[PDB]
Design an enzyme around this catalytic site. Structure first.
Site, short mmCIF file in Angstrom:
data_model
loop_
_atom_site.label_atom_id
_atom_site.label_comp_id
_atom_site.label_asym_id
_atom_site.label_seq_id
_atom_site.Cartn_x
_atom_site.Cartn_y
_atom_site.Cartn_z
N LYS A 1 17.08 -18.33 -0.41
CA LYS A 1 16.65 -18.50 -1.76
C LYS A 1 15.15 -17.39 -1.84
CE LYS A 1 14.22 -22.18 -1.35
NZ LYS A 1 14.13 -22.14 -0.46
N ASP B 1 31.19 -16.78 7.24
CA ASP B 1 32.71 -17.43 7.98
C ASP B 1 32.34 -18.50 8.13
OD1 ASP B 1 35.54 -17.17 7.82
OD2 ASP B 1 34.55 -16.12 9.76
N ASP B 2 31.94 -18.70 9.18
CA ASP B 2 30.99 -20.31 10.14
C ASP B 2 29.82 -21.28 9.92
OD1 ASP B 2 32.41 -22.99 10.73
OD2 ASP B 2 33.90 -21.07 11.72
N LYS C 1 40.16 -22.79 4.87
CA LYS C 1 39.44 -22.22 4.03
C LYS C 1 38.88 -20.58 3.96
CE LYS C 1 36.50 -25.48 6.28
NZ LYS C 1 37.62 -26.08 7.32
N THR C 2 38.70 -20.26 5.63
CA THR C 2 38.27 -18.79 5.15
C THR C 2 39.39 -17.89 4.56
OG1 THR C 2 37.75 -18.97 7.65
CG2 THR C 2 37.91 -16.98 6.70
N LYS D 1 47.41 -24.95 8.61
CA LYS D 1 47.45 -23.97 10.17
C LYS D 1 48.66 -24.35 11.10
CE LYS D 1 44.45 -21.44 13.41
NZ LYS D 1 43.42 -21.19 14.12
N1 ATP Z 1 5.14 -26.24 -17.02
C1 ATP Z 1 6.09 -25.63 -15.54
N2 ATP Z 1 6.05 -26.30 -14.82
C2 ATP Z 1 5.96 -25.73 -13.18
N3 ATP Z 1 7.36 -24.94 -13.45
C3 ATP Z 1 7.55 -24.26 -14.72
C4 ATP Z 1 7.11 -24.74 -16.39
N4 ATP Z 1 7.39 -24.33 -17.57
C5 ATP Z 1 8.19 -23.10 -16.74
N5 ATP Z 1 8.55 -23.15 -16.00
C6 ATP Z 1 9.42 -22.41 -14.74
O1 ATP Z 1 10.17 -23.46 -13.66
C7 ATP Z 1 10.19 -21.88 -12.48
C8 ATP Z 1 9.03 -22.36 -11.33
O2 ATP Z 1 10.30 -23.35 -10.34
P1 ATP Z 1 9.60 -22.68 -8.88
O3 ATP Z 1 11.52 -22.45 -8.50
O4 ATP Z 1 8.66 -22.59 -8.61
O5 ATP Z 1 9.12 -24.11 -8.35
P2 ATP Z 1 8.96 -24.57 -6.84
O6 ATP Z 1 8.31 -25.99 -7.06
O7 ATP Z 1 7.72 -24.01 -6.14
O8 ATP Z 1 10.14 -24.87 -5.71
P3 ATP Z 1 10.12 -25.00 -4.68
O9 ATP Z 1 9.85 -26.69 -3.61
O10 ATP Z 1 11.46 -24.72 -3.85
O11 ATP Z 1 9.63 -23.98 -3.43
C9 ATP Z 1 9.84 -20.98 -12.95
O12 ATP Z 1 10.83 -20.57 -13.57
C10 ATP Z 1 8.91 -21.15 -14.21
O13 ATP Z 1 9.06 -20.58 -14.85
N1 ATP Z 2 46.93 -22.36 -0.18
C1 ATP Z 2 46.85 -22.10 0.97
N2 ATP Z 2 45.67 -22.74 2.11
C2 ATP Z 2 45.21 -22.35 2.62
N3 ATP Z 2 45.85 -21.37 3.52
C3 ATP Z 2 47.00 -20.86 3.55
C4 ATP Z 2 47.93 -20.85 2.60
N4 ATP Z 2 48.75 -20.74 2.17
C5 ATP Z 2 48.77 -20.06 3.00
N5 ATP Z 2 47.99 -20.04 3.77
C6 ATP Z 2 47.88 -19.67 5.30
O1 ATP Z 2 46.84 -20.81 6.67
C7 ATP Z 2 46.48 -19.74 7.46
C8 ATP Z 2 44.44 -20.12 7.46
O2 ATP Z 2 44.38 -21.09 8.59
P1 ATP Z 2 42.76 -20.23 9.14
O3 ATP Z 2 43.15 -20.05 10.39
O4 ATP Z 2 42.47 -18.75 8.98
O5 ATP Z 2 41.98 -21.36 8.27
P2 ATP Z 2 40.66 -22.53 8.43
O6 ATP Z 2 40.16 -22.76 7.44
O7 ATP Z 2 39.74 -20.36 8.24
O8 ATP Z 2 40.22 -21.94 10.25
P3 ATP Z 2 39.15 -23.32 11.49
O9 ATP Z 2 38.31 -24.34 10.77
O10 ATP Z 2 39.36 -23.37 12.78
O11 ATP Z 2 37.46 -21.87 10.32
C9 ATP Z 2 46.93 -18.66 7.30
O12 ATP Z 2 47.97 -18.29 7.87
C10 ATP Z 2 46.92 -18.78 5.46
O13 ATP Z 2 48.36 -17.55 5.37
#
Ligand code: ATP
Ligand code: ATP
Ligand code: ADP
Lengths: 533, 125
Positions: free
Chosen positions: A424, A396-397, A342-343, A501
């Site tokens: 956020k 990374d992790d 994945k990395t 790996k």
């Molecule tokens: N009537 C409305 N009520 C709420 N949001 C609205 C409304 N009309 C438009 N929006 C848009 O919704 C977004 C507001 O969402 P917001 O991220 O504030 O949600 P939240 O309920 O506060 O979330 P969180 O629980 O994650 O804090 C803004 O883009 C605002 O422009």
């Molecule tokens: N298509 C591919 N996808 C993933 N890895 C690949 C690919 N082709 C080659 N590799 C080789 O796979 C190895 C990646 O192993 P690596 O330890 O980075 O994995 P990881 O998912 O990050 O591990 P971990 O869960 O331990 O964090 C590298 O040697 C990379 O060269």
């Protein structure tokens, strides 16, 4: 004392030409108008300003030039950490020693004295607000009070000007910004293409004066190649090019007894500039090509369809985040079984984005750190990321950053809350961001309400068919024809669940014997690891 | 007038009846807290499912009140703080609020101030 439109060019500061106009319009309008009308109105002048921004972006030059243009005496430079002492009631003395000359001249000359400017530095070092965060830096708050009693108070000073400089604008004491005190803030950000061109123009006038520089080198190419350099990295590039060209020329002339015609010439050419740029200077706010070879060690091989799907989805996400309004923050999460690779895929996706700022925050560089230090480091990386038009950060992790152990369970709550808050928070207006996760335990993250913060999810599968294993071996290229034939007859059995790996490790271990017994050893190793979905 | 334009990023469009009901209830609460004499302290709590738009509505209700003092206390400006720092910050905000003759304070994401996590559970007392 200065012409109405002033002048700022070919005198040092070259990148910042609008800043002078902005600050002069906003703050110093009283010291230019004829004194008669100013005295008739009965108004006071501004008694200080504040500057903040990234380090090495040309703040001291601005302060010195502003002081020079106002016809002021020699600036009294000073440093922040220098004014600090463990003895009780000693820092106040250091703060007090700075205004003696101003007091004396005011006492003697009355209301006709000149202008004295004190230039501070790292003013955030003395502040009773850094104590709020984790740590103990109370700096015996008293210190700050003393400073205030000198800017105002019962005893009035009318011939001073205080210019403050800082890097962390969020640690400045709030009592130090009311009217009558430092009351004009400003931002000096990174330069742009024109700024880099102008800086290179200014810093290279000496060589052009004596025709020493060659005609091959350009300045536009070097101005566009350098993406997020500020000022010092450009100066470093020039100096490094000089030194490298000099060393190469002297060594080459020693190697071959060239005539005096070329010996006198010491052209630097363009090769020196490119070599120094690609090997000498390492920017702090730009991409780092050295760390990529530390994660993608064996490249990427296409053994199936999923790789193309993941890469295409990453490209789509990058395109969405690049040119889009109403959504300047985007997140994604990669999940899969251990040893799936994945990395490397995340690093490739980040690299292919061609963004100017790419960073990777991994726990390999946090061994023995307490949780507070981890929070500090994460916040620092994100704060640095917030100062660029386009950025990209990789975590990374996520399991190792939390210190998760199945027994208990146990973990650190501070880091979890910091991550949840940071995921956020949109950047200042007009800037974008992108975040890529990585983890092997999706169920725990779902159970901790963290998957409600991410925006998408991708799946990275393993090798699940015989033909896929044969194709992977063929691409790796380690077994012969009869060897491949023998492997193929015996692995059609199906139910083959391995990671890339582990496959590499098994091949390496099996290849340690004579050619006769490799196949049976490899098959035995595979069978002991032959689990099932 | 810079926080309000920062929390309502895409305005407030009316997609149904509930918005009108919420706004009318907020207006009635504001009028009550302004005109009463034997009830100087009032409180209200807005709750709903995630991603429903609670903060924007709270900010709009606060802004449409015309009180001379208004302030918002969000947790996103206290990253990395300890418990004592949070307590001091909240007490300072309320102490400042106590010096005016008409004030309004918004407390945002109450569940993030206590550091709640379903495992455990764990939080700050
Ligand atoms: N009537 C409305 N009520 C709420 N949001 C609205 C409304 N009309 C438009 N929006 C848009 O919704 C977004 C507001 O969402 P917001 O991220 O504030 O949600 P939240 O309920 O506060 O979330 P969180 O629980 O994650 O804090 C803004 O883009 C605002 O422009
Ligand atoms: N298509 C591919 N996808 C993933 N890895 C690949 C690919 N082709 C080659 N590799 C080789 O796979 C190895 C990646 O192993 P690596 O330890 O980075 O994995 P990881 O998912 O990050 O591990 P971990 O869960 O331990 O964090 C590298 O040697 C990379 O060269
Ligand atoms: N146009 C420019 N903008 C910024 N810095 C410049 C410019 N031209 C030259 N420099 C150099 O960049 C450095 C900026 O000042 P310096 O005191 O080193 O950094 P800072 O004050 O930002 O910590 C100096 O070495 C200065 O000579």
């Amino acid at each position: 004392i200065i012409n109405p439109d002033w002048n700022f060019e070919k005198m040092g500061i070259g990148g910042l030409d609008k800043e002078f106009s902005d600050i002069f319009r906003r703050a110093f309008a009283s010291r230019v108008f004829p004194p008669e009308i100013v005295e008739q109105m009965g108004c006071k002048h501004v008694k200080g300003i504040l500057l903040y921004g990234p380090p090495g972006c040309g703040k001291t030059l601005l302060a010195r030039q502003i002081g020079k243009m106002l016809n002021a005496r020699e600036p009294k430079v000073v440093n922040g950490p220098e004014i600090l002492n463990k003895y009780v009631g000693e820092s106040e003395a250091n703060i007090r020693k700075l205004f003696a000359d101003a007091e004396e001249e005011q006492r003697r000359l009355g209301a006709n004295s000149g202008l004295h400017i004190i230039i501070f530095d790292e003013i955030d070092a003395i502040c009773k607000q850094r104590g709020s965060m984790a740590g103990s830096t109370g700096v015996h708050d008293t210190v700050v009070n003393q400073l205030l009693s000198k800017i105002d108070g019962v005893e009035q000073l009318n011939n001073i000007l205080v210019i403050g400089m800082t890097n962390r604008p969020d640690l400045i004491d709030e009592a130090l910004l009311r009217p009558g005190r430092l009351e004009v803030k400003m931002e000096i950000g990174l330069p742009d293409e024109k700024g880099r061109l102008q800086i290179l123009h200014i810093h290279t006038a000496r060589m052009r004066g004596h025709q020493l520089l060659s005609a091959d080198v350009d300045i536009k190419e070097l101005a566009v190649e350098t993406k997020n350099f500020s000022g010092a990295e450009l100066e470093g590039l020039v100096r490094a090019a000089q030194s490298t060209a000099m060393n190469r020329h002297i060594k080459a002339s020693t190697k071959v007894e060239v005539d005096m015609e070329k010996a006198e010439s010491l052209q630097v050419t363009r090769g020196d500039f490119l070599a120094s740029l690609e090997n000498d200077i390492k920017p702090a706010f730009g991409t780092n090509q050295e760390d990529y070879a530390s994660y993608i060690m064996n490249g990427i091989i296409k053994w199936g369809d999923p790789v193309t799907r993941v890469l295409d989805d990453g490209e789509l996400l990058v395109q969405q985040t690049k040119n889009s309004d109403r959504t300047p923050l985007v997140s994604v999460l990669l999940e899969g079984p251990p040893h799936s690779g994945k990395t490397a895929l995340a690093a490739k996706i980040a690299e292919e984005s061609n963004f100017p700022f790419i960073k990777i925050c991994s726990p390999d560089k946090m061994i023995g750190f307490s949780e507070t230090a981890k929070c500090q480091a994460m916040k620092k990386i994100f704060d640095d990321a917030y100062k660029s038009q386009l950025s990209c950060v990789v975590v990374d992790d996520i399991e190792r950053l939390l210190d998760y152990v199945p027994i208990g369970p146990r973990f650190s709550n501070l880091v979890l809350q910091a991550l949840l808050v940071l995921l956020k928070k949109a950047p200042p207006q007009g800037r974008k961001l992108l975040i890529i996760g990585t983890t092997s335990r999706k169920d725990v993250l779902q159970e901790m309400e963290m998957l409600n913060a991410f925006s998408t999810t991708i799946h990275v599968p393993n090798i699940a068919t015989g033909e896929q294993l044969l194709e992977a071996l063929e691409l790796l290229g380690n077994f012969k024809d009869k060897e491949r034939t023998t492997i193929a007859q015996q692995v059609k059995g199906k139910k083959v669940w391995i990671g890339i790996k582990k496959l590499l490790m098994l091949i390496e271990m099996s290849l340690q014997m004579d050619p006769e017994y490799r196949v049976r050893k490899f098959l035995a190793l595979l069978r002991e690891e032959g689990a099932s979905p």
